[PDB]
Amino acid sequence: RTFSYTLEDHTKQAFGVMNELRLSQQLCDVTLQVKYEDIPAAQFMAHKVVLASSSPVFKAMFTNGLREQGMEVVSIEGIHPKVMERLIEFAYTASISVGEKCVLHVMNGAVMYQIDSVVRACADFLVQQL
Amino acid sequence: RTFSYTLEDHTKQAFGVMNELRLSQQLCDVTLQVKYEDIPAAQFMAHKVVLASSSPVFKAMFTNGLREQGMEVVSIEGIHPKVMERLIEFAYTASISVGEKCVLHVMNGAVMYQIDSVVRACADFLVQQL
DSSP states (O other): OOEEEEOTTHHHHHHHHHHHHHHTTOSOOEEEEEEETTEEEEEEEEOHHHHHHHOHHHHHHHOSSOOOSSOEEEEEESSOHHHHHHHHHHHHHSEEEEOTTHHHHHHHHHHHTTOHHHHHHHHHHHHSOO | OOEEEEOTTHHHHHHHHHHHHHHTTOSOOEEEEEEETTEEEEEEEEOHHHHHHHOHHHHHHHOSSOOOSSOEEEEEESSOHHHHHHHHHHHHHSEEEEOTTHHHHHHHHHHHTTOHHHHHHHHHHHHSOO
């Protein structure tokens, strides 16, 4: 009747390119300003649809019906820069790495953005070192 | 030294959500107006970063350094609406289906946007029916 085809690799390749576009600040449309205790701010550019695709919290926050018309800054307080960076990194690459003291703070950032995949992975490392 | 983790499923889930966001016209930032012979126009909303992630042609066309500040319309002539729809669909889901007369016109749309994965798949169906 009909001919179809699926490339089983397409999502990995494309996130790859989207991660490239982020590192080069191309097509970005949100900057997260994270400010946390005394460490000065950081800025992260990213793509709102890529954030919303991995976090129900970023989904809800960016899908409200408002229109961008430029760059929206999101002030994000209550999380160390290094934890937001690794969580954006997970959004864009599906991987995440950390040492054993930061693994506590990463499960708190993942719970805050409902990145449940990371939450369960941390919660496993925490009982596999106890 | 350090603890890391990779969710081998994350890209498929997230494209899933991005495809959802497209169907609902949320966070979109390009409308392709395809006009082709006498069939009237069609409009497709999509996410420029998701287009650019799957097509070198859409990459180059959206990554020039210009800023969006709203919705950019791309006039796309020289391809049937049904072929652009299925190619956007491939961008967002990695799959594509078609009957045997449209499979000719899809390999021409894929070559036009350098969606090489589809091009080689069509080029195989064309010699597997001859």
